[PDB]
Design a protein around this motif. Structure first.
Motif, PDB file in Angstrom:
ATOM      1  N   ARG A   1     -59.140 -13.397 -37.528  1.00 44.97           N
ATOM      2  CA  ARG A   1     -59.208 -13.318 -38.981  1.00 44.97           C
ATOM      3  C   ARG A   1     -59.242 -11.867 -39.444  1.00 44.97           C
ATOM      4  O   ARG A   1     -59.977 -11.519 -40.367  1.00 44.97           O
ATOM      5  N   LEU A   2     -58.439 -11.018 -38.797  1.00 41.53           N
ATOM      6  CA  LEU A   2     -58.393  -9.611 -39.178  1.00 41.53           C
ATOM      7  C   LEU A   2     -57.856  -9.419 -40.588  1.00 41.53           C
ATOM      8  O   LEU A   2     -58.163  -8.404 -41.223  1.00 41.53           O
TER       9      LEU A   2
ATOM     10  N   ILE B   1     -45.948  13.452 -63.543  1.00 38.54           N
ATOM     11  CA  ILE B   1     -46.750  13.711 -64.730  1.00 38.54           C
ATOM     12  C   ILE B   1     -47.693  12.560 -65.058  1.00 38.54           C
ATOM     13  O   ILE B   1     -48.711  12.791 -65.729  1.00 38.54           O
TER      14      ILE B   1
ATOM     15  N   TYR C   1     -41.393  15.289 -70.902  1.00 45.41           N
ATOM     16  CA  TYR C   1     -42.190  14.129 -70.531  1.00 45.41           C
ATOM     17  C   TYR C   1     -41.409  12.863 -70.854  1.00 45.41           C
ATOM     18  O   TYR C   1     -40.602  12.835 -71.788  1.00 45.41           O
TER      19      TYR C   1
ATOM     20  N   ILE D   1     -62.688 -11.238 -32.883  1.00 45.58           N
ATOM     21  CA  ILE D   1     -62.132 -11.676 -34.159  1.00 45.58           C
ATOM     22  C   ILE D   1     -60.710 -12.194 -33.980  1.00 45.58           C
ATOM     23  O   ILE D   1     -60.346 -13.242 -34.527  1.00 45.58           O
ATOM     24  N   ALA D   2     -59.884 -11.477 -33.215  1.00 42.99           N
ATOM     25  CA  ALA D   2     -58.466 -11.817 -33.137  1.00 42.99           C
ATOM     26  C   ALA D   2     -58.260 -13.211 -32.556  1.00 42.99           C
ATOM     27  O   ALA D   2     -57.493 -14.015 -33.099  1.00 42.99           O
TER      28      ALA D   2
ATOM     29  N   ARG E   1     -65.839 -22.160 -34.346  1.00 45.89           N
ATOM     30  CA  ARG E   1     -64.885 -21.505 -33.462  1.00 45.89           C
ATOM     31  C   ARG E   1     -65.502 -21.088 -32.136  1.00 45.89           C
ATOM     32  O   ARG E   1     -64.794 -20.541 -31.285  1.00 45.89           O
TER      33      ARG E   1
ATOM     34  N   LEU F   1     -60.718  -9.363 -43.515  1.00 46.99           N
ATOM     35  CA  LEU F   1     -61.616  -8.221 -43.627  1.00 46.99           C
ATOM     36  C   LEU F   1     -61.082  -7.213 -44.638  1.00 46.99           C
ATOM     37  O   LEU F   1     -59.902  -6.852 -44.612  1.00 46.99           O
TER      38      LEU F   1
END
Lengths: 95, 117, 103, 132, 138, 26
Positions: free
Chosen positions: F1-2, F22, C83, E118-119, E54, F5
Motif C-alpha cells: 500500500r505504498l 511572472i 505581462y 508494506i509492499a 493481511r 502513504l
RNA sequence: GUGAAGAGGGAAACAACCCAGACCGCCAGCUAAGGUCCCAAAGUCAUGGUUAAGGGGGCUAAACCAUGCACCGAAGCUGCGGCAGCGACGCUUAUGCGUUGUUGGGUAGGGGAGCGUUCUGUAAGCCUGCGAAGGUGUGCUGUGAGGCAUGCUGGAGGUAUCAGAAGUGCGAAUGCUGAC
RNA sequence: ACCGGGAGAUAGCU
RNA sequence: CCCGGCGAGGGGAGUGAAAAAGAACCUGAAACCGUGUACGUACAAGCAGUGGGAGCACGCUUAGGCGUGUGACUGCG
C-alpha cells in the motif's frame, strides 16, 4: 492518366528555371516544344529535356495520344546547397 | 535528470500561433511579433466589447430620431412623451419597430404627442 | 404579429414559434414559463400600452435546454508592460421557444 | 436577433427637387448635407449610402446676409466673381466640406446634382418636389 | 572542459559545448532516522497489517525437500501467492525453494524492513518469529 | 500500500523557484 | 490631489485642466464634467434683452447674458447572469451552504492556491501491432498554466492514483550552435 | 611576440 | 523496358508490410521557397488590428438563417 517526370539536382539557379518554365505553364506540348526551342536561356535546355522525358514516360507507360497531352502542372523548387540547386517537375496528361 | 524543452515549447508556440491567423505577413509567422499582435488584438477586442454598447446606442438614437422626424416631432420631445406616457419600451425595440412596421411607430408617436401636455 | 417582453432586463421582440435567446433563468427544462411582463402586443391593429407592464395577456415559453455560450478571451492587461493576463469567459444562456401570444 | 443593417443594393433611393430661391446658404447646405447622408430615412446606416438624389436649382439665388457677401474668400478667389462665373461651385464646396471624408463621403456627394437653371434634363427621373 | 583560450571565453555555460553552470557532484542522500522513530514506524506497520487481516500466523512453516514445486503447492493450498514469509533460523530448504519464485520472499526475523512489509500483500511470520519481533521491538 | 502513504499536511513545502516567469512572483 | 503604480469621458490634438477608480458578459435603463447646425448623439426649443466680437463650412443666431422644461453624454449608478476574497445568524465541523453586507485598478514587495517535462517505488499492474511516443487538424472542457477523444502520418513503446529528487517551464543578455 | 597555468583572478557598472 | 548525352536524373515492371523504407534511405514540425483553389488588391500615407459589416466562392440549412474562406465601407486605434 497523368504522367509525371522530374529532374533533380539541376546545375542551375532555381529562379531562372522558374522564369523559363512559367512561359509554358498551361500550354500544349506541340507548341510548348517550339516555345522552348528558341529560348536562349540555359535552363530552357533542361526544361526541354524534362518535358521530353515526361512525354516519353506518358507514351510508353500510359496508353496513347501524345499529341493532345497538356502541361497541366509545371514547377521548379529550391534544392540542396553545395550555390543553390533546383528540382524541376513537369506533369503531362490528356486533360 | 536532464529534461528537454522541445515538446512543451513547440506546443506553446503552436497554441499562440493558431489564434493569430490572418495578420498580414510577419505578424502571422514571426512569434516575436505574433505574440505582440495577438496581445494588441485582445486589448482592442476588450475595448470594443464596451464601445459596442455606445455605438449601438448612438445608432438606435439616430434611427429613432429619423423615424420621429417624419411625424413632425423631435427625438427629445418624443422620448420625453414616452417617459411621461409611462412606456418602458427601450431604444432598441423602438428602432426595430421603426424599421420593420410604421403603424406601431405612428401609434407610439401619437400617444407621445397626446401625453406631451 | 409579434410581442415585446422583458425577461433579463433587456427587452426582446419575439414572434410566435421562433426561439429567442435569454439569460440563464433557473427553471427546469420540462416546465414552461409564463412572462407576465409584456411590454407590447403586436397584431394587425396593435393594442397600445396605456399603462406600463400591460396585463392584458401573458407569453408562454418553453426552455428546450440550458447551456453555456461561446468562449471569449479577455485580456485585462494593458500598457504593454510585458505581462500577460488572459482569462476565459462562457456566459450562460437559455434558448426559449415562445408559441402563442395573448392579446 | 441582430440589429437591422441597410443593404447597399436593395435600398431604394428616391429623387427630390430643391430650389435655392431666397434660401440661406448655411441652412440650405446643412439640410442638403443631412438629407444626402440618409439620416432622415429610418433605414439610416453609417456605412451605407442610403441617401436620396437631391437636385438644387437656381444656385445663383443663394442668400447670405451681413458683411459675408464680401468678407467671404475662396481658393485666390472672391465670392462675387465665383458666384458670377459658376453659382453651383459655392454649394458644391459647402456640401463637400459638410460631409464625411472618405470614399463613402465622396460617393454620397456625387449624388448631389446642382444647376443654375430651372430646366434640367434629369426630369426624366421623375424628380419629386421638395421644400427646404 | 578540455581546452583553453580567452580571446570572451568558449567554455562559458552559454557557449555551446561549455561546462554546466551548476554541474552536479557525487553526493550522499542517506537520511538519519531515530531508532525510536524506526521502531515506532515498524510497530505501526505491524498493527495496521494486523487490523487489515493481511497478517497470517503459522505454528511452523517447513518444507520436506529443497524443491520449489513443493513450496508453490503449499502456498497454493493456503490461497497465498504474494507473501513475505518470516521465520527464525533461516532454513536452507525454504530459502532455496523461495529464491526462484518472484512473488515469494523469505527473510529472517531481524531482516524485516518497512518497504518489504508494506509492499507485499500478506505477511506470514512463525510463532518463533513473532516472539523474536516482539522482543526486538521492545 | 505504498500509494496510500502521503506526508502530513504542512510538513513538506514545495518552495519558491524565483526567476521562472511572472506568475510565480519573482 | 494627480503619475510613479489609474483605465474611461470632455476641453479639436496633448501626462499637468474638469468629471471619474476598469471582477467578467449583455445589440438594457438613469447620470457627473461637457454638449444639442452638419461633420458627430442630442432643442435649428421657449421666454426678455445685447450684437458685427465667429477644429472645417457656415452662422444673424449656428455669438453672449438669466430663467424653464427636455435630450445625448464614461468602464459612474442601477437591471439580469457568472466567478473569488473577507466580517456575521444558523445547521454544517473537514463542506455544502439557507444567506446576509461589502470588497475584487495596480508597478516594487509579502502571503496563499495551482498546471506542466525527466527519472525512482507503487509497476512481472494498466494500455498498446484491432496501433505506443512524436508530428499534424478538429471538437469538448477548465477564470488560467493545461487535460480529454478523434481524422491522416508515424510503426513500438507510454504510464493511471499516491509520494521522493530536478541539469525543470525562454522573447531579447552587441548570447552560443545549425538553417534561410 | 606567441602558447599553457595561477584564473570560474581582482573593484566597477552595464 | 523506356526517355535521356552509352551521362546525371526520371517513369514503368518487380522484391518488399510499407519504396508515404531507394543507398542524400526511422520519425521529418518552424523559418524560407513554389503550384492549384477562394477572396481582396493598386496616388504616397502608417497603422496594417479591432466592433459593426455588405459583397464575393464553398457546405449545412425544407428554407430562413448558421459556420468556415477573404474583407468594400465604416467608429476607435
Amino acid at each position: 492518366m497523368e504522367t509525371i517526370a522530374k529532374h533533380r539536382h539541376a546545375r542551375s539557379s532555381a529562379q531562372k528555371v522558374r522564369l523559363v518554365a512559367d512561359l509554358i505553364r498551361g500550354k500544349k506540348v506541340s507548341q510548348a516544344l517550339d516555345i522552348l526551342t528558341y529560348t536562349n536561356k540555359k535552363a530552357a535546355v533542361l526544361v526541354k529535356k524534362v518535358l521530353e522525358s515526361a512525354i516519353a514516360n506518358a507514351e510508353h507507360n500510359d496508353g496513347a495520344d501524345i499529341d493532345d497531352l497538356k502541361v497541366t502542372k509545371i514547377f521548379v523548387d529550391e534544392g540542396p546547397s553545395m550555390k543553390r540547386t533546383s528540382h524541376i517537375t513537369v506533369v503531362v496528361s490528356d486533360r | 535528470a536532464r529534461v528537454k524543452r522541445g515538446v512543451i515549447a513547440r506546443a506553446r508556440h503552436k497554441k499562440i500561433l493558431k489564434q493569430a491567423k490572418g495578420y498580414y505577413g510577419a505578424r502571422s509567422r514571426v512569434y516575436r511579433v505574433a505574440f505582440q499582435a495577438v496581445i494588441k488584438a485582445g486589448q482592442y477586442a476588450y475595448r470594443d466589447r464596451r464601445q459596442r454598447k455606445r455605438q449601438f446606442r448612438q445608432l438606435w438614437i439616430a434611427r429613432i430620431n429619423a423615424a420621429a422626424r417624419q411625424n413632425g416631432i423631435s427625438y427629445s420631445k418624443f422620448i420625453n412623451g414616452l417617459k411621461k406616457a409611462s412606456v418602458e419600451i427601450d431604444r432598441k425595440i423602438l428602432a426595430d419597430i421603426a424599421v420593420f412596421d410604421k403603424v406601431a411607430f405612428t401609434a407610439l408617436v401619437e400617444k407621445a404627442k397626446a401625453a406631451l401636455a | 404579429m409579434y410581442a415585446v417582453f422583458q425577461s433579463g432586463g433587456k427587452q426582446h421582440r419575439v414572434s410566435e414559434g421562433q426561439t429567442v435567446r435569454l439569460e440563464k433563468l433557473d427553471i427546469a427544462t420540462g416546465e414552461t414559463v409564463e412572462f407576465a411582463e409584456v411590454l407590447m402586443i403586436a397584431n394587425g391593429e396593435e393594442v397600445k400600452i396605456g399603462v406600463p407592464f400591460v396585463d392584458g395577456g401573458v407569453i408562454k415559453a418553453e426552455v428546450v435546454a440550458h447551456g453555456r455560450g461561446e468562449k471569449v478571451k479577455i485580456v485585462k492587461f494593458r500598457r504593454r508592460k510585458h505581462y500577460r493576463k488572459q482569462q476565459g469567459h462562457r456566459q450562460w444562456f437559455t434558448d426559449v421557444k415562445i408559441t402563442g401570444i395573448s392579446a | 436577433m441582430k440589429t437591422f443593417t441597410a443593404k447597399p443594393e436593395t435600398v431604394k433611393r428616391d429623387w427630390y427637387v430643391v430650389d435655392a430661391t431666397g434660401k440661406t446658404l448655411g441652412r440650405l447646405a446643412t439640410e442638403l448635407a443631412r438629407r444626402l447622408r440618409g439620416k432622415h430615412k429610418a433605414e439610416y446606416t453609417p456605412h451605407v449610402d442610403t441617401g436620396d438624389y437631391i437636385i438644387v436649382l437656381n444656385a445663383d439665388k443663394v442668400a447670405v446676409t451681413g458683411n459675408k457677401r464680401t468678407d467671404k474668400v475662396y481658393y485666390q478667389a472672391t465670392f462675387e466673381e465665383m458666384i458670377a462665373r459658376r453659382p453651383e461651385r459655392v454649394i458644391e464646396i459647402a456640401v463637400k466640406g459638410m460631409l464625411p471624408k472618405g470614399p463613402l463621403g465622396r460617393a454620397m456627394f456625387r449624388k448631389l446634382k446642382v444647376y443654375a437653371g430651372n430646366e434640367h434634363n434629369h426630369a426624366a427621373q421623375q424628380p419629386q418636389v421638395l421644400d427646404i | 572542459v578540455t581546452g583553453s583560450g580567452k580571446k570572451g571565453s568558449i567554455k562559458s555555460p552559454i557557449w555551446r559545448s561549455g561546462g554546466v553552470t551548476f554541474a552536479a557532484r557525487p553526493q550522499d542522500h542517506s537520511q538519519k532516522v531515530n531508532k525510536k522513530m524506526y521502531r515506532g514506524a515498524l510497530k505501526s506497520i505491524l498493527s495496521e497489517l494486523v487490523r487489515q487481516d493481511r497478517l497470517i500466523v503459522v505454528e511452523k512453516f517447513s518444507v520436506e525437500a529443497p524443491k520449489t514445486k513443493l513450496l508453490a503447492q503449499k502456498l497454493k493450498d493456503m490461497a497465498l501467492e504474494d507473501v513475505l514469509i518470516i521465520t527464525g533460523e533461516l532454513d536452507e530448504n525454504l530459502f532455496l525453494a523461495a529464491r526462484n519464485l518472484h512473488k515469494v520472499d523469505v527473510r529472517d526475523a531481524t531482516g524485516i524492513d518497512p518497504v518489504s512489509l508494506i509492499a507485499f500483500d500478506k505477511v506470514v511470520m512463525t510463532a518463533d518469529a513473532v516472539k523474536q519481533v516482539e522482543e526486538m521491538l521492545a | 500500500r505504498l500509494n496510500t502513504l502521503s506526508p502530513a499536511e504542512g510538513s513538506k513545502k514545495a518552495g519558491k523557484r524565483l526567476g521562472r516567469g511572472i506568475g510565480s512572483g519573482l
